[PDB]
Design a protein around this ligand. Structure first.
Ligand SMILES: *Cc1c(COP(=O)(O)O)cnc(C)c1O
Ligand SMILES: *Cc1c(COP(=O)(O)O)cnc(C)c1O
Lengths: 401, 401
């Protein structure tokens, strides 16, 4: 009998553990549609070009490796707030925001969670949309908050349940926290139309809720970064002081680099200062300071007009591919004789597809064809290459027939 | 009013805050002897040659940026354990340990605290040496643990108070946590001798305390990495099953790249596997997975013989440097005419010198000479160059005369 005799075996991450499994699989035909990481046309990891170039400018600049400030690389911090809020943004232009660099979107979400935990004085309840990215839960629960939920996706409709979203939402108690995905709702793939966003926002405003936006796929909803930040900025423009999480993980394909940020909309520029100090005091004992290379790469591209332009064309290309994949997806599905409706594959947006597959359906795909995905029938459509759209289709069909 | 209208403006970090201040001083002659960050003889940031080399092989390797597993890069992982534990290590050879990559030393300390709080049931109190590094307090506190202390440094004599320490230690309640700095006690720069270390082991074994080692300067106290891990290793062979934190921040001079690790020694390999599960379960909702740049490098060096060799020679060279500065500093103080004994300057090991100066004196250094240090009068020795060594000397003379 010792120290850790009592600790039991925990399970494998529902998302992340798929990669694990994936890697152990000897079938050469294997695919990992678990997590959402973009592959190019040959099924390979794709490092954007502007990333490479920036990588190089850093190298050639022979920079040091001294510590970052707690809040991160200023230059990155600011570029992020602009990318998000928009250059013409009041809130932006008047200095009422604070943004600290974080450990990508997860770390960002968390300090955000912990900040709410420590200062938000009116409630410990956080309302998540049904369903929501799995990590949401543990991020908020480990932070000290309790979780609630508001209806969002209708499975018989394979579309948003706006009505229910609004009934639920309209009944959330005044001054509660509501997690809203900025765009590219993980895992549904469905987001509200402007008209509906416009609507939600009135109730948030109306019920005086703290709105927490998580923006991990800016650019991926449509391929247009500003058309994707519409919602967020709207809200803010109606007078809703939100909080936000951002990740350059997917859109810059800096996955393991860890680049994200957390921002808080304040009243003044004075409040902003005040809050930052606290943010910092939250962080020091967390990780001391952030990992620098990701932000360097990113800060360089955001702030270098050339780099920036190329980036944006690369992002558009990414989106485009995926789209082609959906399209190819369903057509082969028919080509294969599938009596089922597969329009969802084409109507949804972002990096996945919320297939509808049942967990048995799910297993069979892993087992028989080594196609790896999540228990919720959620597939990374972004990890499918041209050469494998066809196999996916067969498998799916085979599983679904 | 406002969500945050009550958020108070907090104070700058006791250590990390001097750098901020430092950056604002316009005197050409400033020196940042605050944080323990090494500079070459010209007072310039020193990126190790083996560091420079490893980055070159990664770029040349044209590697990807995909996510790393939760615990991190296995090679990095395996390596630090070894680095720490030793290769002839039994616990290492058997695989009774679990190492997870972390966000340098802090994030390691922090996950370790977070693990303790979750699973260590036999206590809620962590015993810190007096004094300890500043960050330790908040790390544990923020983590939900209770803080205690044992005597360590006697300031009257400016030496370790082995007696008190031992009194304090022997009466720690059974099965509590005691934090011990593996080497290079920060800020004291005063470590137990091998015979005291052998005493200490004896009682922790006896009271049957949980030993948390903080190991940040492996290689900087003695100039020899193996020599620096003697006690860690000592305790282990004595059957004390430890928890340990690593920083590659100083010794690999990888500061802002954030590389480090946390490791818990377990009874079996079986059990380690169970902890590892848990450990990962803790990290995901924290920052999902660690930054990858720093680990690639580190693992590249620790795992490539040439690289490892030169690193050892690089670290030893670093260590000798600081000994030169120490010495020079005192003899310069003599020549300037300082009435006092400045023996501790040469007695203390690691990057620093715990000078014994008073607040006023330090205030005077910053103000008049622009020399920046911690209000407890702890100077960064590793921060002085051949070229500014006199300045400091004169300063310290004028403020102390
Ligand atoms: C990817 C993602 C995030 C952030 O992930 P990181 O890799 O840590 O940047 C946050 N939310 C959702 C819904 C995501 O899909
Ligand atoms: C520097 C140091 C650490 C680790 O520093 P990081 O920047 O987090 O890597 C841990 N403990 C002590 C006592 C230190 O001096």
């Amino acid at each position: 009998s010792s120290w850790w005799s009592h600790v039991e075996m925990g399970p494998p991450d529902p998302i992340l553990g798929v990669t694990e499994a994936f890697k152990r699989d000897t079938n050469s035909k294997k695919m990992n549609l678990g997590v959402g990481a973009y592959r190019d046309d040959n099924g390979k990891p794709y490092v954007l070009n502007c990333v490479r170039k920036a990588e190089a400018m850093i190298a050639a600049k022979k920079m040091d490796k001294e510590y970052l400030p707690i809040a991160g690389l200023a230059d990155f911090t600011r570029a992020s707030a602009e990318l998000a809020l928009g250059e013409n943004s009041e809130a932006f232009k008047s200095g009422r925001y604070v943004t600290v660099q974080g450990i990508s979107g997860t770390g960002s979400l968390r300090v955000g969670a912990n900040f709410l935990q420590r200062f938000f004085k009116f409630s410990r309840d956080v309302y998540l949309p049904k369903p929501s990215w799995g990590n949401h839960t543990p991020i908020f629960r480990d932070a000290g908050l309790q979780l609630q939920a508001y209806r969002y996706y209708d499975p018989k409709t394979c579309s948003l349940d706006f009505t229910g979203a609004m009934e639920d939402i309209s009944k959330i108690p005044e001054k509660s926290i509501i997690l809203l995905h900025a765009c590219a709702h993980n895992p549904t793939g469905v987001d509200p139309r402007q008209e509906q966003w416009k609507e939600l926002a009135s109730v948030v405003k109306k019920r005086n809720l703290l709105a927490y936006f998580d923006m991990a796929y800016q650019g991926f909803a449509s391929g247009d970064i500003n058309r994707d930040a519409w919602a967020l900025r709207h809200f803010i423009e109606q007078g809703i002081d939100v909080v936000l999480s951002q990740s350059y993980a997917k859109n810059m394909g800096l996955y393991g680099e860890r680049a994200g940020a957390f921002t808080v909309i304040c009243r003044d520029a004075e409040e902003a200062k005040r809050v930052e100090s606290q943010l910092k005091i939250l962080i020091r004992p967390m990780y001391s300071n952030p990992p620098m290379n990701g932000a360097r790469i990113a800060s360089l591209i955001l702030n270098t007009p050339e780099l920036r332009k190329e980036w944006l064309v690369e992002v558009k290309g990414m989106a485009d591919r995926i789209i082609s994949m959906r399209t190819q997806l369903v057509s082969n599905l028919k080509k294969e004789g599938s009596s089922h409706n597969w329009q969802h594959i084409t109507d949804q947006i972002g990096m996945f597809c919320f297939t509808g597959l049942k967990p048995e359906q799910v297993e069979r795909l892993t087992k028989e064809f080594s196609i790896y995905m999540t228990k919720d029938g959620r597939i990374s459509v972004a990890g499918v290459a041209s050469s494998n759209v066809g196999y996916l289709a067969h498998a799916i069909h085979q599983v679904t027939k």
